[PDB]
Amino acid sequence: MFKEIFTRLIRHLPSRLVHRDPLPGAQQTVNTVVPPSLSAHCLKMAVMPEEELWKTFDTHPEGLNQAEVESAREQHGENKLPAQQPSPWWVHLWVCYRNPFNILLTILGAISYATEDLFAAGVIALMVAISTLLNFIQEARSTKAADALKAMVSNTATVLRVINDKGENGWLEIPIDQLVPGDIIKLAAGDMIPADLRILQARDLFVAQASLTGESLPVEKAATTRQPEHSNPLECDTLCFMGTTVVSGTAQAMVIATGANTWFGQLAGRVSEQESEPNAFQQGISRVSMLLIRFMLVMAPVVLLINGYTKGDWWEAALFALSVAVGLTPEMLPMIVTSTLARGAVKLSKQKVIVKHLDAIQNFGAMDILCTDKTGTLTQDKIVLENHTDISGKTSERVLHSAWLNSHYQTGLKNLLDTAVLEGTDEESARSLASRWQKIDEIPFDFERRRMSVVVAENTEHHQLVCKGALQEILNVCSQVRHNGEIVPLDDIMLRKIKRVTDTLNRQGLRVVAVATKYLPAREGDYQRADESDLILEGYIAFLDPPKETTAPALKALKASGITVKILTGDSELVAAKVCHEVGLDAGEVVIGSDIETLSDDELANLAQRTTLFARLTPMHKERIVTLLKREGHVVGFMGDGINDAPALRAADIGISVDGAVDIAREAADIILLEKSLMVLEEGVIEGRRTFANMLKYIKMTASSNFGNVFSVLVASAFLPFLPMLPLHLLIQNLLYDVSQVAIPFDNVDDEQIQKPQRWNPADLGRFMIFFGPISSIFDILTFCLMWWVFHANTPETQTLFQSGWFVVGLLSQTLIVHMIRTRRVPFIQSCASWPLMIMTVIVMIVGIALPFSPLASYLQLQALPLSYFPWLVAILAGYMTLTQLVKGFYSRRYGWQ
Amino acid sequence: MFKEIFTRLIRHLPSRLVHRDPLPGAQQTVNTVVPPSLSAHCLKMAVMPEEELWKTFDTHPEGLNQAEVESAREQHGENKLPAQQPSPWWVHLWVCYRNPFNILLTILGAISYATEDLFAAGVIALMVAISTLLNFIQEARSTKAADALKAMVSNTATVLRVINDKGENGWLEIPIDQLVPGDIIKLAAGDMIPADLRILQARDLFVAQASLTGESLPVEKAATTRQPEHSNPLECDTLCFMGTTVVSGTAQAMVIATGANTWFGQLAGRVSEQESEPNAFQQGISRVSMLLIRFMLVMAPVVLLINGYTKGDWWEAALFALSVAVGLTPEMLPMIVTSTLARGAVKLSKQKVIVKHLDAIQNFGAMDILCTDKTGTLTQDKIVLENHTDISGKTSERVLHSAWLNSHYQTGLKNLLDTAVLEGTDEESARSLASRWQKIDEIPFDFERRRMSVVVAENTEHHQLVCKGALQEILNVCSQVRHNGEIVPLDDIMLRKIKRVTDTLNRQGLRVVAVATKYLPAREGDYQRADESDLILEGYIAFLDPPKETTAPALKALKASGITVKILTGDSELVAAKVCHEVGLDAGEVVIGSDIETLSDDELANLAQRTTLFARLTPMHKERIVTLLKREGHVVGFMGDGINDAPALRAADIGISVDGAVDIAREAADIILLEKSLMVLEEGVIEGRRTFANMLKYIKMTASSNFGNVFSVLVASAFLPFLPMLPLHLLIQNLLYDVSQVAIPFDNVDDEQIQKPQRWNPADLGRFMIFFGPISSIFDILTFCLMWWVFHANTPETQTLFQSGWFVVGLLSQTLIVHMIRTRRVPFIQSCASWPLMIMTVIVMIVGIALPFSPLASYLQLQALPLSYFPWLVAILAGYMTLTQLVKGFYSRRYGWQ
Ligand SMILES: [Mg+2]
Ligand SMILES: [Mg+2]
Ligand SMILES: [Mg+2]
Ligand SMILES: [Mg+2]
Ligand SMILES: [Mg+2]
Ligand SMILES: [Mg+2]
Fold this sequence. Notes:
Two copies of one chain form a homodimer. In chain A, 46% of the residues lie in helices and 14% in strands. By secondary structure, the first copy, chain A, is α/β, with parallel strands linked by helices.
């Protein structure tokens, strides 16, 4: 066969509902380090004087007013990527109608009846148009809902703009797509850079550019250049590029590039080539589409040839074969996938689960390994008890005040310890410390040393550096300790005593953060990580972050649903083990991050499968573990809401984040929970399994029934002297079946189907079609024999009695058989269809019965049915239902339902 | 007027759906200390030899098999009170059919149309029967649902019985109502005594008979009497009476009395007289019923007299007046109340809120003060951190092992500290302690000393008494302390040091429990509370009980709903204040239990209104505070799940308990939550407000519309020369209106209505009826003028056109006006009725329109309507809806909706 390139009958869904958005962190590799005239633009913009910067982008310090912002947006486009913009509704309608089969059905309708029989080609074209409108309405509604959902959780930026008719400025939180060039924004800790920026002003601004320049340490970004030569746009200290995060400090900057013109946007990724590699969902949809095309190409030519030879009307035989084939079209797939999944995605939104792209639902129900941190998900993130003590265990007010200085004057992201220390200090002492101490510098947090320092001063003679961090890291750089009010050298005896005391505290679930301080002579230069030396250890703060009340039932439900929860944490091994024990998780033997640095990929992939808790992990370790956990066909989900969780979120088969996360965590995620809870995640997983099961059932039943109709036509058309059913009748039958099937997205799903992670095999559809097609053909042939002999529709002159006689059987059975094949159990007593499906089935059956008796029947070439036919019809339908119910068991035994 | 005794037209609901159960704790007062032949029976039963006890009750040691238990149940009745047995369905159908208006209607129908006009009386009787059937079906379904709900949470008993064909025994948990006399049960801690019992065997069995004998201290019940003279059935140490709890120990006893024959059941309460005093809900229902009777008695005689004088047919005028009056019958109140409340009670069951009696819903939505303990509701009942140390602060293994002995060998109710100590001790040391030590005696917990002791022994030479309890109570009875391994006298310096250290610990939210041990020479006699003297203080255990993750949002929602949460706790004020601060509650200034002992009732009632946290409370203090919190018309709810919370649950306006509570706590409660959570309680309160609002709306709309119809008849009957509508048509109109109103229980309620605690005024119904009745009468008179002149129904010969002309207007407006006078807002845009109500309204309107055109119209004396009438009908309906919508505002301003 092959000839896959020749087949262009498949219409792919737009690559925003499916497939992930490009995240600007596609490694440090670049296409010849960007092209000229783009690097030159950045290099000129970096050192351009601030005075003439205002004229270049038509910007004023006040900001931008409305008419100006629409003018800038029109001139420079919108702050998006080429693939994130929706096509106009008329283009969507046209691309739905120009389907290579909707066209032929209209042309063959024109050709067959053009000479001397009009109103028959027109009605066929009208049926084609009605089917096209139904498909287009379903897809348009579902894409509108999906696009609304994706825009519900979108990274925002704080801009000046101009609010109030008066013309006053403000600070609006607007979606990052609305940023036009020459716009003024302000940046704080945790905000991702929304576009290429020119730093107007900034204090202690550190940005994590690891995505672009590949360096983990945050880089200071100044208002004016303080480095001698630039020679490179990516390292100029006065421009911030899109896709990088702000670690600490504050800034106010100007947007210079936007959308495609952004560094990452053009020639450093995204714009280069396209989405060459499709994900699992797109591959499965393509496989199903190719299977349907193969079925049609095998069957329809034979149906054409048989009737052409038998009846000598090729222009009508071809139309008849195409009309029976259109039931097996691939164009159902865009309508089924979009309508069924977007129904789930909306329903998940009422469960505090926002789905950014539709295909993620497949992973969300298929996930069997869930990697997450212990803080916030297992623990409460609010610490109830805290003790600030010195090395001797006595409570110390100096430790609390030293920690308060660091917590108050740090500009990084807020922490639970920071919140506790700011709340744990009384108002009077806090006011005295604030008035008596002023900030001079800040050395932010990085994982190489795992500390955080703040340099303050009470005068202009000496400065005090106060750094707080995990106990060892602090003890590594401490040379003296403050014991009993005296500064005494920190010998090894005190080292081992402190270590064992803090290990005893850790085994109780208490996290310990040590605090160190130093006095230095006043200096003008910036402080650097080398200044964290010969410190004086003031003491440590031991605090308890208790586990959530709902963590244990959520973990039990997750395990009952087939999901293996794995804890990836950068905290201590003892605290993590205690937390795991308290919530009911089995920590087993713990694996620290230092252990896996010397392991091979095979060794680590084999170890991670039997290891539940990983401790002392750097973000690189988390990403590597998540990557190697997909080794044996597992679908891995990573849940994280941190600055450095973007690679881990992007590397997992599904990334889950929280509405309160940092900007880069929400950008890289596929699912956004409105509250950080494992129970919400479990219920969402259970509900997404239902959505995927409903989608599969939709495709499965439609394809099987339509294959049965095509087989019925193929086997019995040769013996008849006329078409078993007029193609107009077949088009009406398919349209009325689709109207009924509209309510399948709202069906009920057995708890048996969604009890374990779902595995989707597109080749199973062919087996289901082959098994459940001829069952319909048996009763179709029985109906043919009924109308031939019992009702004497033996000649073409009385063909209309035959054809209509099949029509009501064709539509009613195909509509009824849904309630038999939708479940593996016995219907109407064990598993029952949802009320919308019941109502739609009843309505479509009534319409199909009443159509031959309606005034339209003459126009549709349908003849009224004698009353002696209805008992036969009921017998046929009941026999078909009973036979399929009795035969379902064999399919269950040999292959299985799920 | 008065003559309230004469009015027996009111049919009260059965006193199980409304009103509380007896709760065998009705003080210590008795009716002459019970009657003779009951006290004598108990006295003879107590001292009767165990050998001959088996023949008396036809009981075997192995238990009772089936046929024997049904025989005993038939002979002795069922273990219930006379007010808890439902009446048979046929008796319920008779009482629903024999009400004076269903009898007078039938009798007048026979009288008026018996002579020469049969099939007119029969159809009227058939309409009466159909109305009775509808009412009976609604009430029967709703009482069945309510009785099923009350049986879901019922105190159970553990019985031997017989299981399976073999004849082997087990231990079944059967509802206490199934207990027949001469049944063998076993009792553990926390089990209430289900019937009068004879103790067969007992291991350290203590029962709290504070309800019966009035003494707070638990007393020891033995297998054989160990006291010289009994002289009193209530103080014999070998019988346990119903309504008392088991504090500690284990036992196996025999049931000797059951149901009424129980000491409490007969002549000691719940038997003499009856429920003389009705509660608030019953009083309100009676007031509404009396208002409806007053309306009918004022109006219907005038309607009879006018038509009797005008048309000279008294036997028909009386029937017509009664037919218009029956719309205002109080017999709908049993159907309205039972059907609307039960639908709520069922809906609460899916929200983990079981309602034991329907009227409690009224209180549940009317609650504005909620009194709870801090443990379990505000805090988790599991403790995350525990430190067992000595007085010097060093960790001590002896303290942990001493606490483990007490926790393991105590037979009382389990505690969070007991669970932690049993889990906090390693397996090896635990098994070593279990093998090395054996239990001898136990001194249970009581609030006078607030300690609990266990006497064990490692040999037959000396015994060790290990008591554990709150710090002061332990320190009161301690004379020595184990310091640095030496037993040193406990001087005042150590007392102050320990007090300040433990006060520092309690300000952190850490509860401190001290442990004391003593060595005594071996002795045969039982140990007594006195034996707790000159103890040796081993140390204390400080543990953290963390607040729940969901307590703060639940408290904020409760405050937003208008409920004032007050904390009644027996713990320290420092720990309670810290817990309140953690969850966001404002403790204010705390009031300890010792402060309120000297206060007067007025002083304590005034103080409790502005006090949020009450600490160091005995159960008597809790009951007194809850009683005095209802002083200014507040509705008080008490939530508790303890042994001593029965008086406080019974004294509150509503009592809430948990499914895992003790037996007496579930018996005294009105609401049972399936999980102990404040969020569940808040959502249940919100949804119960909806149920009560729906019930009030039901009554209000029905009464107002039917009053409007009666007024329309009263004003315009004199001018017409015939009845404005035949009474058959009026009965059909009322029946079809009731069919529509069936779906009101499922209506939607605006969030504005249920945003504050509900206050129900039965006199408001009269104002609503007076305001909204004549609005219907205006358009009824307009319809009369229409049919008189526009349609020329001027004579009796053409009366049928007139009457039917009103009929469709009468039914359709009455059915439509629901969607206008159900909300204070504008309908269909700002507030919408529920889909069941929409469907029922449409169906009833369709039936009313189609009835005059149906073949039944001739049988019902209805004439088909000309098509020129329908535009006038739409005009009348639209004008009525618009006028009532515009006029609703005046009722809102002058009186108000809620
Ligand atoms: Mg932001
Ligand atoms: Mg600096
Ligand atoms: Mg078929
Ligand atoms: Mg029990
Ligand atoms: Mg004893
Ligand atoms: Mg009316």
